[PDB]
Ligand binder design. Structure first.
Ligand code: BPY
Ligand code: BPY
Ligand code: BPY
Ligand code: BPY
Ligand code: BPY
Ligand code: BPY
Ligand code: FE2
Ligand code: FE2
Ligand code: FE2
Ligand code: FE2
Ligand code: FE2
Ligand code: FE2
Lengths: 288, 288, 288, 288, 288, 288
């Protein structure tokens, strides 16, 4: 099974706006480039987010990490047994992503996924944020989460759980209109309450948002003010019902894709109990 | 196996007396209604205790929780293999109990049991006690315990352990008369020393009492005074020999059914050793 | 100023009943005799309570401790300056009380007080309780407290505070009848919330009770059952409003003198704020 | 496998001397009798050591505890499979030992062993030591250890490990004469570094000693002085090389059987590494 | 699988220089001799490093520890199944190495390995360093690590992982020349991040260095000055990218073999993720 | 007032025996010489104990430390005001003792005292014990204590308290014969329960013993065995009634002067209460 979400690549219409957004607003460290992709760091990894030019204005790929070469081969076996098509990343791709091995596939609705092992770390170039942020919570919990839009949640659930080994944490009926809600399914693959959530939202993007977790409440408060100065805030500060992350949401430069910046959630383990919630926020998160 | 006791439903002759008892005396939060049942909360769950009108003046059903849908299906398999009749709760029942799935059955002596997963939580409506109580100990240990009256303890033991997966903690020979005792069997299914105890008592009720565990010793002391003002106390403060819960007992409005309100027990795990005790109280619990 | 209450001597009509009471019920260690006084230990001190025959059936003297010889001389100076009569204990008295020096005086209403330093300790004869009690809280807080009955609380307050150096913690209006209360004044001289309380009670004794503090809640619970078996309980378990001691009261063999046996209070310091309370118990302590 | 050593029974020529020894010297609580056996407590168990009259002046039986009835049946299966004779204790024996079930057998060299479950606990009669000892370390580690004398250590090892499930901790070559040593094998069955040790000593007793572990270093120091006053000391204070228990040894009233009274060892788990030691004491334990 | 590295034996041209180096510079305790080998201690073990005369000026053997006799037999089975030649150490060898059993074999490139159990400990002769060092970190992590030079890292990896049970922690591309690096593979067999590393270095020695871990940063700082006074320093203080050990390197008296003396690394477990690093030092370690 | 005891100088008939005793038995570090005095270290100070040849076979001087130059001048003022003769140590003496300033005087019975400030520390030559001892407890508590023999304890008390600023901790009536005891007075000048004790013993030495405090109980146990091998033990292990130091006593090479080697006492402060004890040992310390 997948151990954690390790990296995200975006294909965007405004690379300079994304550069400013990720550095001056979010606080990530600029880390050069690989091919036509600008790279950004959040920790010791050589990169965590890549931004390349493209008309998609969307998530172009997600990197799903396993712990060693044998684990990668076991994932290849799982894909074969499930009848899921995949190819082995060639040397050029391995060098581009800075990994020792990877499998390239797509989820049932077209999102490219890369299962990899052996990422590059550069502790001799210690992390230096571009904006005041004390650090990010990554480690065994990976880079953060994203909310994946899908046309058929049952079909998506079968793939992410049965093939990739994610596990359902809980469900929230997210209120859309007066008498309409969407049942969002929150999945874990480590202690992070959710790494991927699935929801049948009526938006034209592969994801609704990606989320980064900062070390302190002040990191979140300060980031809110930076994103507010940029005119990007989409939610007030709030705390989620299911994972108790205290966060806010803001627009990225790609229309309809947001970022969530948060702190302080609960973590999970083998004893997590599936439950259902009728709201996304225990408090706050008013849309603005 | 069952993971924890999640909810209790009572059918009672005096619904207003039970309402006052559960709120002003015990401290639970009134939480509206579902059908003809008044609902009461002790924590983040949408409800923990339900009270409906009925001549039984007794426990009408107990909700036994599992962690996910697959676990529920495994319980259905266990029931099938054991030859225990059950039905799947329909949509109306699921909506009434606020659960994602449930199996309806009875124990060997007629107590309706509901095995369920995916209960509703409402963190956006934070718990507010109706009387001064700092909170209840629930979580992975479930709502509390009850002592089930049975005509044949061996038969009841076989069902609760072999079919439902409870595990014997210990036995107390409860003194009844001069030369008479009843061997009460205390069973766990999580860290709570007992979730269900079985005893062959000569009372005309399905249960002897249900128990709630408060967060502090003062919660217990204050509750004693409230129940004393109500004229309901049946035991002085005391501490049990087996789980070291410090509690008192009081009458509910249903004759012969008591409530226990306690604090501070030991918890159990895979290393618990079966032992036998000759008294229910290490100290206190004098009957009044 | 007085540093702590160190010892108590009783003159009683039934020495054997007091012996049984202090050992088998309370748990103190029998420690031989000095003259016609039977001695009892609670800790490393050679003795803490003395019981001698006498018709008083009351507290015969209280030992008030200071830390060294110079402190004793300063107390002699305070007594002289205040015009309070005193004598210096002679060699025989010093040997009887096992102290290096002492001043003998009375409070304004006739209770003999002994101010002393240099008590005997016998760590080579480690404490061994006579009943199941894990130990007592003594140390810098002294042996416990007593509630002193006085005809004029203002006069008593002036003596205990201005002459002896006690400090007011708080006041409780203790309900006596329908429209009658007595303002009990609780005084400290160390971290123990009260060492002496003063009250104008209509009883024919020098004290209402003396109190010992045990190390654990179970010590208190077990002691309650022992005193109940002896037919001596006068209050149910409860917790005080002012010091948050969790205790019960019981009769000693001397009519109208009780003992309090408790656990777990708050302690005080230079920042304690005088406040007023309308009840002695936050919960419990129902009289029986 | 055996979970812990639970009880010991001795058959002795001088029952009064053993009574005084176990109470006034060691500190155990006298706990009545069962049949012709005097009982002694160290904790919440109804009894831990039994003393009956007999010419053996030796260990008459050892009680080996398992956690439940099913575990006892699994032990019966192991005995059957190994060809080890055993009988099931009858009702009279169960009542005598205060257990819910037991198997009676002998080790290869004649020591009666009793494998049992469901011992009696009496928390309503809290432990009260007969001499100043703060308490004993028992719990999941059982009552202590004994060193079993055997004529063939390999044969004894095969039985205790393969049949009963004990596990070798380490070996000490115990110096006997100038060029002679005995390889003592120390076995665990829980966190206690050793519960049984095997050694081919030239003594005419079934055991060399039994050992009790007290809670504090002072407990050990005080006990040394009591046993010295009794003229029973056989070793000065010392600390063992293998388990780092700080203890002393003394004679029991049965010739050639000693007691060890100790504190503060290391505990073990699945990661313990077998090692060999050339001395029993890292320091101390000089024979006197 | 191998549990830890337990001992190292060197065959050297200058035994007195090695003696001075290990004692006065490194701080090990001289511990007599066994045959023609001088022995040195770092802890409770009778010996950890042996130095014998020989023209090799290299590591002569490495002792790989398992926890018990059965584990040794399982290793013999693994060797047999893998077609790896081995012999059982005879009594003379067992006595020389002070072990209860051992298997003698070589790795694929000629380094003698000894798999053993039951080493001698001498707690009655407590460790006394020869130079100011507070102690070494050994225990379950073994004596330290060594970096093994091999002509074919893949072949060496297959042996150390598949046969001996070591597990890959991570890889560092160690820069050699302008456009040349060697991929060093770091292997664990316990919590120590690496016990053996494999690298295809162009040196004529079996190992590049061995490493000892001291308890404090000051131990490392003081040792640096001692080795500097001896003219042996080869690296400044630094900290590694992969295990975060803070250390320095120095020459041993055998040309081309160094010692590493360090403190304060991260430890590993089943959750360690394979990663790749482009530098050996996060900071420092400049070669001098 | 004096802040702590900093150093001791002995004048002895057998300098080599004292050298072996202090290093191989006690564990102190040899630290060269100053004039005709051999120096020994216990910590970062350039020296703590000096040994010079002399027929006295006794303590030749004691160094009493203050914190700065102004404090030394205040001590000179106290001496002047008390009429106590003193001289200022000259440059040669300052260089010999490695201090920035000192006053030379004697106590009322002839013991030379040196009050000093600004001692030399040599952290670049870290402490290295000569025998297995983990370290000594010194710091603000100074080097240890000594018991000073005096012909008139009242006179000695007046000097040590009124002139030097020591403070009485407690008194022990030390049993000498059948109906004879000596009241030993234990004095502190920092958190060490006693730095100097005064007693009217009938011995022909200035002191009865000096004491060093080691960091661990094992340090004490191991030291006992070393001193026993040397034939010097004078007491078994024991623990004191007043300071709860766990120690043993042994003979130094100077007849009638002993050393005490201990661990783990209580410390004192402004709240210490004077008490009296009838024994020196709570347990142990049997004379041998
Ligand atoms: O991390 C999260 C936890 C709970 C809910 C959301 C969410 C809210 C609105 C739309 C989509 C998801 C979320 O992001
Ligand atoms: O929680 C508990 C623990 C031990 C005994 C009882 C009990 C006492 C009297 C009657 C029935 C049960 C209990 O409720
Ligand atoms: O310790 C105490 C704290 C508060 C009240 C009392 C008290 C109650 C009734 C009568 C007298 C005193 C007391 O004893
Ligand atoms: O607990 C123990 C640990 C180590 C050795 C012994 C021992 C010593 C002498 C004779 C027999 C055993 C022991 O009792
Ligand atoms: O412990 C270690 C951790 C990381 C790298 C090295 C290393 C550096 C240079 C040459 C060989 C190995 C090392 O020793
Ligand atoms: O540190 C100490 C504490 C208490 C007593 C002594 C003592 C015992 C015998 C003779 C002199 C002193 C001592 O040294
Ligand atoms: Fe989110
Ligand atoms: Fe109950
Ligand atoms: Fe009171
Ligand atoms: Fe033993
Ligand atoms: Fe290294
Ligand atoms: Fe001393």
């Amino acid at each position: 099974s997948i151990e954690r979400l390790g990296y995200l690549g975006f294909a965007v219409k405004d690379v300079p706006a994304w550069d400013h957004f990720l550095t001056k607003s979010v606080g990530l460290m600029a880390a050069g480039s690989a091919g036509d992709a600008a790279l950004y760091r959040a920790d010791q990894r050589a990169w965590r987010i890549a931004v390349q030019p493209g008309e998609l204005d969307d998530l172009a790929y997600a990197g799903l990490e396993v712990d060693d070469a044998a684990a990668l081969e076991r994932m290849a076996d799982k894909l074969r047994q499930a009848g899921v098509a995949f190819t082995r990343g060639d040397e050029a791709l391995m060098q581009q992503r800075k990994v020792m091995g990877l499998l390239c596939l797509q989820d049932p609705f077209g999102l490219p996924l890369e299962i990899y092992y052996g990422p590059a770390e550069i502790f001799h170039e210690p992390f230096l944020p571009s904006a005041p942020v004390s650090g990010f919570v990554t480690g065994d919990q990976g880079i953060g989460h994203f909310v994946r839009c899908v046309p058929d949640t049952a079909k998506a659930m079968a793939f992410y759980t049965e093939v990739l080994g994610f596990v359902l944490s809980d469900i929230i009926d997210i209120q859309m209109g007066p008498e309409t809600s969407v049942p969002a399914h929150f999945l874990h693959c480590n202690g992070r309450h959710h790494t991927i959530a699935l929801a049948a939202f009526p938006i034209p993007k592969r994801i609704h948002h990606f989320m980064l977790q900062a070390n302190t409440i002040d990191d979140v408060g300060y980031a809110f003010d930076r994103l507010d100065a940029a005119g990007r805030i989409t939610s007030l500060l709030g705390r989620h019902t299911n994972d108790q992350t205290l966060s806010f949401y803001a627009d990225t430069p790609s229309p309809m894709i947001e970022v969530e910046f948060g702190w302080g959630p609960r973590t999970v383990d083998s004893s997590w109990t599936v439950a259902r919630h009728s709201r996304t926020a225990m408090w706050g998160h008013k849309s603005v």
